[PDB]
Every structure is written in C-alpha cells, then in structure tokens.
Amino acid sequence: FTLIELMIVIAIVGILAAVALPAYQDYTARAQVSEAILLAEGQKSAVTEYYLN
Amino acid sequence: FTLIELMIVIAIVGILAAVALPAYQDYTARAQVSEAILLAEGQKSAVTEYYLN
User: Fold this and answer.
1) Which distant-in-sequence residues (6+ apart) come within 8 Å of B2 by Cβ?
2) B16-52 b/e with 16+ CB inside 10 Å = b?
3) CB–CB of A49 and B7 under 8 A?
4) How many angstroms separate the CA atoms of B46 and B50, rounded?
5) Neighboring chain A residues of B4 at a CB cutoff of 8 Å
6) Chain A contacts of B1, Cβ < 8 Å?
7) What span, in angstroms and rounded, lies between the C-alpha atoms of B53 and B40?
C-alpha cells in the first residue's frame, strides 16, 4: 500500500493557485496602474504650473 | 523638480519695462523740450530787448 502517497499528490495537484496571484495581478495592476501614475507625475508639476501661473 | 525656477524666470522675462522708461521719454522729452527751452533762453533777453527799448 502506497496510495495515500498518491492521494496527497493529487491534493498537491489540485493547487490553490493562490489568491497571491490575482491579488498580485491586482498589484501587478498596481505596477502598471503605477505606470499610469508615473505618467501623472509629469503632469503634477505641469498642471500645477498652469494652476500657479 | 525645478520648474518653479523656470516659472520665476518667465516672470522675470515678462518684464515690466518700467513706466520709468516712458515717463522718462517724457523726461527725455523734458531734456529736448529743454533743448527748445534753451533756445528760448536766447530770445528771453532779445524779446525783452525789443520790449524794453
């Protein structure tokens, strides 16, 4: 008898595929969301520039 | 960030061009207006000369 050793595999086979993937496509999103933010960084002072002058 | 240093330039670039230029073309005028007056200075006594004699 070994099957419970196979059972535990197929328990490992059914993986979670952690929410630490989709919370980190949401924070990979935070990466390229930031890529949008880093654009905004340029306009921060330029928009400001119009706003002040 | 430095742009406000550029802003302040373009605030210096837009200069007043002081009214102390056109009030002093008006007083540069007072210079050559005086140049007309200094002519008149000669006639002061000569006109007077006719007026008295």
Assistant:
1) none
2) eeeeeeeeeeeeeeeeeeeeeeeeeeeeeeeeeeeee
3) yes
4) 6
5) 52
6) 45
7) 19
